[PDB]
């Protein structure tokens, strides 16, 4: 496992490190959206930051299951429950939870 830049938005030198992590914070209980990204590993986007994505570039075809492990780095006193979903081909970006 290598770090997946889910937060691939900042682009100025001084903010590059911010792409290595994304945030969560207290909300209003309406099952709000935290983040999204395509699962395509050999496509332009977050996966380019990973060593898998880069090695993938040296091959025309791939096959297999992928795995993304999310690590929470808030304080010990912070709790919470998230729903992480994978939508197979054909399904448009989910409008709601």
């Amino acid at each position: 496992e290598t770090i997946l830049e889910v937060n691939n938005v900042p682009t100025n030198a001084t903010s590059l490190m911010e792409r290595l992590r994304f945030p969560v914070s207290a909300q209003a209980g309406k099952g709000e959206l935290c983040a999204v990204f395509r699962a395509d590993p050999g496509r332009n986007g977050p996966w380019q930051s990973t060593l898998l994505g880069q090695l993938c570039g040296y091959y025309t075809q791939w096959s297999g299951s992928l795995e993304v492990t999310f690590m929470f780095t808030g304080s010990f006193m912070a709790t919470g429950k998230m729903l992480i979903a994978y939508t197979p081909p054909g399904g448009p970006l989910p409008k709601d939870r």
Binding site: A26, Q27, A28, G29, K30, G31, M77, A78, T79, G80, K81, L83, R97
Partner: protein, 245 residues
């Protein structure tokens, strides 16, 4: 090692690190209808993975003044995913359920919810207050769908019975200082082997605060309660066109 748990069914997995074991209602697991209990002759359809999976249907906000809520089964799912479609296209339906109510807070919040399952939860009305009027609950109150419905008089469960005795039904408590969820597995309960998923609600899920939510100013005040549930051993028969009610 009883505090931690993983529930995997279909293409869905649930995890919890503050559980309080699991309750198997009336001590028995869901099962398919046997050939001697059955009466209908058509060969049933058992979709398996496409319908026996976890569906997260709704989130309510727990407030210091909340009175409590209830949902009806299988009503909450009759319009969701592949399970809903089968329920609509078929006259006969039967299944069990794995219910997982989620609610987490902080080690500085407090409160306790009673999570219980009550078969044949018939709702009553206040009878015009004086009790001389034979009023009846409207369809949206008896079968509230996924949004559920808020109890008007929790002390008598809106049906003239003491909530203090609700613990005689399969339950768990979500006491914030202890756990952040309740998990109850319920078998099919009825006097018939199959029934209409539309006209009959086998049981109701009750989530009622017994010890009010409390916390000091400054702590996260938005404390959601989410309802996730999975049908188990779903069977359907009596095929024809889809009907919503």
């Amino acid at each position: 090692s009883d505090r931690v748990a993983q529930l995997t069914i279909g293409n869905s997995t649930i995890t919890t690190q503050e559980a309080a074991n699991i309750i198997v209602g009336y001590g028995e697991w869901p099962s398919y209808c046997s050939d001697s209990d059955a009466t209908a002759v058509d060969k049933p359809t058992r979709p398996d993975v496409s319908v026996n999976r976890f569906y997260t249907l709704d989130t309510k906000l727990w407030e210091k003044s909340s009175k409590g809520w209830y949902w009806k089964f299988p009503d909450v799912l009759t319009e969701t995913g592949v399970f809903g479609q089968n329920a609509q296209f078929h006259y006969l339906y039967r299944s069990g359920f794995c219910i997982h109510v989620q609610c987490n807070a902080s080690k500085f919040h407090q409160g306790a919810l009673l999570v219980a399952v009550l078969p044949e939860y018939v709702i009553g009305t206040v009878a015009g207050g004086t009790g001389t009027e034979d009023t009846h609950p409207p369809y949206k109150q008896t079968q509230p769908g996924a949004d559920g419905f808020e109890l008007q008089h929790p002390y008598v469960l809106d049906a003239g019975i003491p909530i203090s005795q609700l613990t005689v039904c399969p339950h768990q408590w979500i006491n914030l200082r202890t756990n952040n969820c309740a998990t109850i597995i319920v078998p099919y309960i009825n006097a018939l082997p199959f029934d209409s998923a539309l006209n009959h609600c086998n049981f109701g899920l009750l989530v009622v605060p017994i010890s009010p939510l409390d916390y000091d100013q400054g702590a996260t005040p938005v404390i959601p309660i989410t309802i996730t549930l999975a049908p188990m051993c779903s069977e359907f028969a009596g095929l024809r066109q889809a009907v919503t009610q």
